[PDB]
PDB file of C-alpha atoms in Angstrom:
ATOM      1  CA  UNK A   1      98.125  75.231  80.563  1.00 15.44           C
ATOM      2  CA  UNK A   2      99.578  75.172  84.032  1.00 16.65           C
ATOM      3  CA  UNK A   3      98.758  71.860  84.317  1.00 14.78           C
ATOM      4  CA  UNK A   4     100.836  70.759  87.907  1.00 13.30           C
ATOM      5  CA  UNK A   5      99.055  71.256  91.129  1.00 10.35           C
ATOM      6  CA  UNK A   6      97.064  68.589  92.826  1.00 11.73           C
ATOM      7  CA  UNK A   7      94.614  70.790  94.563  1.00 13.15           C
ATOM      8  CA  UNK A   8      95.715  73.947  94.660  1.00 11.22           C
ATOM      9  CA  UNK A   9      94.523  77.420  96.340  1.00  7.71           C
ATOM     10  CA  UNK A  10      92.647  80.390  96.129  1.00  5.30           C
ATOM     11  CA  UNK A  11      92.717  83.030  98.535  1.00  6.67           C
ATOM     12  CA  UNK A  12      91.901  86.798  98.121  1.00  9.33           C
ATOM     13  CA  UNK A  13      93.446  90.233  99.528  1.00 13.28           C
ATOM     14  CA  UNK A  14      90.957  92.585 100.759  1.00 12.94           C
ATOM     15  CA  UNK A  15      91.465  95.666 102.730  1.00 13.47           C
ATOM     16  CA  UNK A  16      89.955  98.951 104.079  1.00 12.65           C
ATOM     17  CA  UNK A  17      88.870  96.686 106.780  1.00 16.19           C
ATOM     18  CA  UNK A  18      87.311  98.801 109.852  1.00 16.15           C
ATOM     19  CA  UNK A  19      88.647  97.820 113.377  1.00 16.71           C
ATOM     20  CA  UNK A  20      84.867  96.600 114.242  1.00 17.41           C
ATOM     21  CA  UNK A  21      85.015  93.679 112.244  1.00 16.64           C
ATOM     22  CA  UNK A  22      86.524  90.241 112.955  1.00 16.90           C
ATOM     23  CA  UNK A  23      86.810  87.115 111.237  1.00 15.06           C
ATOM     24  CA  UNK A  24      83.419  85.899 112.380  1.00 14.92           C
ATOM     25  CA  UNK A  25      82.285  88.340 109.588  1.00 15.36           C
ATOM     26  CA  UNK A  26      84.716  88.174 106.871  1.00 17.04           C
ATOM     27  CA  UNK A  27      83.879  84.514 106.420  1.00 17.90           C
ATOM     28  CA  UNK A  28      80.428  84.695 106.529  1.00 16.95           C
ATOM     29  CA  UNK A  29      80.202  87.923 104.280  1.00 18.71           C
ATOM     30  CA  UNK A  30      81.665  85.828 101.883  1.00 21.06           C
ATOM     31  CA  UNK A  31      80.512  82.265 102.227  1.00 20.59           C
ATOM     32  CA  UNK A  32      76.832  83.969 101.886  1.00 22.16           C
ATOM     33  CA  UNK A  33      77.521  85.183  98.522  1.00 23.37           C
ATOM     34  CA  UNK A  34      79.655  82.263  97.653  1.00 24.44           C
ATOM     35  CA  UNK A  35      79.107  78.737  98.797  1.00 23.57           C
ATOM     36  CA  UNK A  36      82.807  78.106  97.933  1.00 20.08           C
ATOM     37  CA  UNK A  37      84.534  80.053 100.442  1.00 21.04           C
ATOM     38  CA  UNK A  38      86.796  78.022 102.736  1.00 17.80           C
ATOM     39  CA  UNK A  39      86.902  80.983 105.531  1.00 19.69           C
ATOM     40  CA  UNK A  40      87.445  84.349 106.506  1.00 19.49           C
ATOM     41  CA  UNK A  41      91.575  86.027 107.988  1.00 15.79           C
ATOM     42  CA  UNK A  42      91.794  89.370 108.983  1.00 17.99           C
ATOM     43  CA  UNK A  43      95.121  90.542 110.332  1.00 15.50           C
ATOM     44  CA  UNK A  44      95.505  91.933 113.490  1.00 14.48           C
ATOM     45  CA  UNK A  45      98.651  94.262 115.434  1.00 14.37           C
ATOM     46  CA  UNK A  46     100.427  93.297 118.407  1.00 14.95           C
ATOM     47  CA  UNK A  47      97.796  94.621 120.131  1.00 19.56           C
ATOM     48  CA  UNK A  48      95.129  92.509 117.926  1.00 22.88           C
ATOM     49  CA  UNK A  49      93.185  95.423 116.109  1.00 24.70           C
ATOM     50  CA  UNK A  50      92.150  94.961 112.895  1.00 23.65           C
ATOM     51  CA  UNK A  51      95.401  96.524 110.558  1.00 22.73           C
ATOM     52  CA  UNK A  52      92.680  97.564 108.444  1.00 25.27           C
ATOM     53  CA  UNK A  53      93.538  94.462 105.326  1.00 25.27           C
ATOM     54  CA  UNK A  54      92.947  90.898 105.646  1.00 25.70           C
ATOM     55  CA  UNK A  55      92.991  87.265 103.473  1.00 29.28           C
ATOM     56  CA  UNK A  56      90.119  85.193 102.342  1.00 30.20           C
ATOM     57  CA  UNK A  57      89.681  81.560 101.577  1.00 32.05           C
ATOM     58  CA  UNK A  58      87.911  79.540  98.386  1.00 30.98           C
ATOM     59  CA  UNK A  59      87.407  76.367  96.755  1.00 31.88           C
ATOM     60  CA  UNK A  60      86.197  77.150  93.376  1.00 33.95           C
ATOM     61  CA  UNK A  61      87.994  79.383  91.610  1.00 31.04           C
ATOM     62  CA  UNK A  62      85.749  80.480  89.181  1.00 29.83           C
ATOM     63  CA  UNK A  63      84.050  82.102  92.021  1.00 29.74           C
ATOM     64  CA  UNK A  64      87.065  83.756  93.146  1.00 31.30           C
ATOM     65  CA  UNK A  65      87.167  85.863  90.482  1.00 28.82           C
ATOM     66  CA  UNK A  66      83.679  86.563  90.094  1.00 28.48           C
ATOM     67  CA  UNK A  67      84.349  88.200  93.730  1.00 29.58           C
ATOM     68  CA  UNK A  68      86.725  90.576  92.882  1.00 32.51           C
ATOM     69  CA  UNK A  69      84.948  92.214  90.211  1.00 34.71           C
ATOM     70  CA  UNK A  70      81.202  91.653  92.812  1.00 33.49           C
ATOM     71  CA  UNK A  71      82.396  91.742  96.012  1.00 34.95           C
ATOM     72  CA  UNK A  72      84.505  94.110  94.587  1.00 34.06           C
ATOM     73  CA  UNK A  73      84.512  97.457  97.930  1.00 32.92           C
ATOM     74  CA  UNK A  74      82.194  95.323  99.682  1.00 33.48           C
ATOM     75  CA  UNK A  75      80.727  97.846 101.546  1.00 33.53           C
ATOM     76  CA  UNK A  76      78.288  95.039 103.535  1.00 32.25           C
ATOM     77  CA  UNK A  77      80.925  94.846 105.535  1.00 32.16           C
ATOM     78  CA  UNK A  78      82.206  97.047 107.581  1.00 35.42           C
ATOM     79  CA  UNK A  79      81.083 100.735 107.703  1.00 32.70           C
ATOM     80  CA  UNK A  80      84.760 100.620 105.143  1.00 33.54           C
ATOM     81  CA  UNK A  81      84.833  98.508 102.011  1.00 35.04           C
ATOM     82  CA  UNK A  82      86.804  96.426 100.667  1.00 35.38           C
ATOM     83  CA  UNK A  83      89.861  96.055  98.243  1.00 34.83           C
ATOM     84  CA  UNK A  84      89.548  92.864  96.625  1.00 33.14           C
ATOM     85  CA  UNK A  85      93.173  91.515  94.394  1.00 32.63           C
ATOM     86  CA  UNK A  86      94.429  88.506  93.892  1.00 34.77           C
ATOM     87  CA  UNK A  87      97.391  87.398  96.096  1.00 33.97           C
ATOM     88  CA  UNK A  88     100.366  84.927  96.079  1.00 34.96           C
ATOM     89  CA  UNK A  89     101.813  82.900  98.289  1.00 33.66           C
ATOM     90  CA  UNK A  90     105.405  82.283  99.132  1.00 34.45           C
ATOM     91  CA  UNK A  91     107.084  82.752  95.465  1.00 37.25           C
ATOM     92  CA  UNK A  92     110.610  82.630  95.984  1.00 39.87           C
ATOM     93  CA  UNK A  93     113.522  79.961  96.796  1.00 36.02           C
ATOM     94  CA  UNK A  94     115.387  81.235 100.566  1.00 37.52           C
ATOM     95  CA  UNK A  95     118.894  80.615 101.241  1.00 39.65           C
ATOM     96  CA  UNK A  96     121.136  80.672 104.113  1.00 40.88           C
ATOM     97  CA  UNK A  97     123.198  83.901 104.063  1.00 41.94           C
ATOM     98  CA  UNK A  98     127.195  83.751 106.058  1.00 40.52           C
ATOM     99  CA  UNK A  99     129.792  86.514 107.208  1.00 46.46           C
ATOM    100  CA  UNK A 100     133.343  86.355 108.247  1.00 42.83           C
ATOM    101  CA  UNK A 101     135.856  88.451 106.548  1.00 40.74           C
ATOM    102  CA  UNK A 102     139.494  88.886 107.167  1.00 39.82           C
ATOM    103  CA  UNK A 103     142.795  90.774 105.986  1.00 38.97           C
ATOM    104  CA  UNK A 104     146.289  89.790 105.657  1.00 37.47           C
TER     105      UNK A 104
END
């Protein structure tokens, strides 16, 4: 129905992630279960700890789904689980914004 998009993506939000585990992990958690996943992104602070939420990659998206309802609080990995949603990328149209008043 949405016919319109020459490749497009599917990524997933996951969460609850413990400050022990890195990317490294989050990939291959995933790529085990799924031999579609495209790779693992966990978000780090300014200081680089784990926020405690990251981003995953896939190819297939029939898969994706079927994670978020199994890998659904993925426990595997790390001693947290995980929140597993679906996400969206930049949906919006930005424009430049001006000032510069003045009275008579």
């Amino acid at each position: 129905g949405s016919s319109g998009s020459s490749g497009p993506e599917y990524s997933l939000f996951v969460g609850d992630l413990t400050p022990d585990v890195d990317d490294g992990m989050l990939y291959e958690f995933f790529v085990k279960v799924y031999p579609s996943c495209r790779g693992g992104k966990v978000v780090l602070d300014q200081t680089g700890v784990s926020k405690g939420y990251g981003f995953v990659k896939f190819t297939d998206e029939l898969e994706q789904k079927r994670a978020l309802t199994e890998c659904q609080g993925a426990v595997g990995l790390g001693s947290k689980p995980v929140r597993l949603s679906v996400a969206i990328p930049k949906a919006s149209r930005v424009k430049p914004v001006e000032s510069g008043p003045s009275s008579g």
